[PDB]
Amino acid sequence: GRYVPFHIQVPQKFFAIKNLLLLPGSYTYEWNFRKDVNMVLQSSLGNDLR
Amino acid sequence: MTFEVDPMDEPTLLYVLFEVFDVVRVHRPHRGVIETVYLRTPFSA
Amino acid sequence: ENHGTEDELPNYCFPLGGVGNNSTYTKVKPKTGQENGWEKDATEFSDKNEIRVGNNFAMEINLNANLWRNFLYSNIALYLPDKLKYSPSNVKISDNPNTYDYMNKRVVAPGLVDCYINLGARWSLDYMDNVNPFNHHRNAGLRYRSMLLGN
Amino acid sequence: ENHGTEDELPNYCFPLGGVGNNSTYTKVKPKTGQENGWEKDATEFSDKNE
Amino acid sequence: DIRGVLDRGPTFKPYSGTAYNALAPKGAPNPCEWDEAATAEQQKTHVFGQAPYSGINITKEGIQIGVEGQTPKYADKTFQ
Amino acid sequence: RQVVDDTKYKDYQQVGILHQHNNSGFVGYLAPTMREGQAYPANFPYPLIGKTAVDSITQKKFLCDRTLWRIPFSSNFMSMGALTDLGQNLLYANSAHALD
């Protein structure tokens, strides 16, 4: 279907962060995400989704 | 550098990867503290 | 995994002779002094000349839908639970439902597994989920051990 | 490896029209105050209905 | 773990072919009525039909498809 | 997979197999028999894609065939020996216990 309530599990892909082992304390961890359909979705013919 | 290619009738891009070393050292002196030293050579930041 | 089939180009069947049915024509030749004058030609040519006007006689078929429908029936539909089956109209069947004869004669409605079931989705059929899929004829290993024995 | 043909359901090919050889039928209307009275109609309808 | 609701819109199509009357010829129209020009304005309704069902009779009450003991039973027009 | 709604979908009618006629007059009626009927429009199923796409709910499941479900009796649930760390502890090995 066109209409989809979803749940997805996203990994941190950045090399320095991901192989790190983190010791005691508290930390700020903040990220940014894109909402533009032509980047987050992908279409077969490569049509402008907006 | 001089690269020779086929005539393409619609704009294209030459994608060049310069292979360098890109290392990071990570230091945690006290509880909740993190310091980092970055080095990338060739091409220093 | 219902992803549909190629159906872009129509497929056609034609007579053995290509052409199909034809009608009988006499030749004619023009009168040269007129703009529109004609005269029968029965010189060295036959009076019973075969002509088909139009394109050749045909029937049209979609191949891949026929194949798909047969696949869906062969590999899933016939293997649906017996509460979903029925017994043949005006024919005998076994008393014992544990027999090959009862399993060969119970009638399943083809409309239960038609070409558009779960179209665009990856999903096993809920009535076949309770059913042992190793009890099926596309078991290559059991088929191989039977053919080690013979025909 | 002859395991015989998968051919339980019959497969069919049909004419371009999906119909084929037909006959011509004339529309008729009922006479409403009679049980089984009927009258020929060639007014707004074509008299040769395929 | 990211959750949300998506709409992939009306241009999406995850299958090749049609779902609907798949075994029908690509040229064949549905059985139909049309006004065609005669003039003998005076345009005549032509029908292209097909009647596959054999019933018991035809009265003004429709085609008879059965009996309710003594009484004859006729086709419900809503779907039959 | 996605299936049609009946909670916020207002137009809904449940049409049975007995009167479904997608592919009418190309195939036998609810039997593997020869072609029956005439050509006509198709009534089933509703479109789950396209401009007129009906409201839909989501059904999720999985299969996992040819396997056993596994609950190893161990502190951290790793393979650190064929003799289990929890099978060795003074609470569970040197006392007796009933299980429910």
Side-chain angles (χ1 to χ4, degrees), chain B:
Chain B
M1 304 189 89
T2 284
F3 298 96
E4 201 161 268
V5 303
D6 295 332
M8 299 187 75
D9 71 334
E10 88 190 298
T12 32
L13 292 171
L14 166 74
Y15 177 25
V16 186
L17 302 78
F18 297 99
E19 290 203 63
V20 294
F21 280 105
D22 210 358
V23 180
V24 196
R25 181 135 175 203
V26 187
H27 180 71
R28 287 175 301 248
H30 304 289
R31 179 186 171 125
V33 191
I34 180 176
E35 306 185 77
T36 42
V37 179
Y38 284 72
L39 190 59
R40 179 187 68 171
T41 49
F43 299 124
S44 312

Side-chain angles (χ1 to χ4, degrees), chain C residues 22-35:
Chain C
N22 61 61
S23 163
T24 47
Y25 292 72
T26 319
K27 194 153 171 301
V28 305
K29 69 171 167 176
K31 301 188 172 174
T32 42
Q34 280 172 20
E35 290 188 72

Side-chain angles (χ1 to χ4, degrees), chain E residues 26-38:
Chain E
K26 294 178 172 74
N30 296 301
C32 49
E33 282 176 337
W34 55 102
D35 302 315
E36 198 182 293

Side-chain angles (χ1 to χ4, degrees), chain C residues 88-140:
Chain C
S89 201
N90 293 17
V91 186
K92 297 294 220 184
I93 185 160
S94 202
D95 286 294
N96 179 0
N98 287 278
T99 70
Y100 168 56
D101 190 45
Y102 184 76
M103 295 171 188
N104 183 59
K105 287 182 172 61
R106 289 294 272 174
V107 184
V108 78
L112 288 173
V113 210
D114 191 6
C115 304
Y116 50 75
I117 58 116
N118 302 303
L119 182 64
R122 192 177 189 265
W123 189 269
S124 55
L125 214 162
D126 302 297
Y127 308 120
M128 290 303 289
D129 284 358
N130 306 346
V131 163
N132 191 0
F134 305 107
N135 280 17
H136 189 233
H137 81 280
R138 294 199 167 204
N139 187 1

Side-chain angles (χ1 to χ4, degrees), chain E residues 54-65:
Chain E
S54 178
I56 317 176
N57 182 242
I58 304 180
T59 62
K60 59 195 166 330
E61 280 172 303
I63 179 148
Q64 192 201 326
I65 72 182

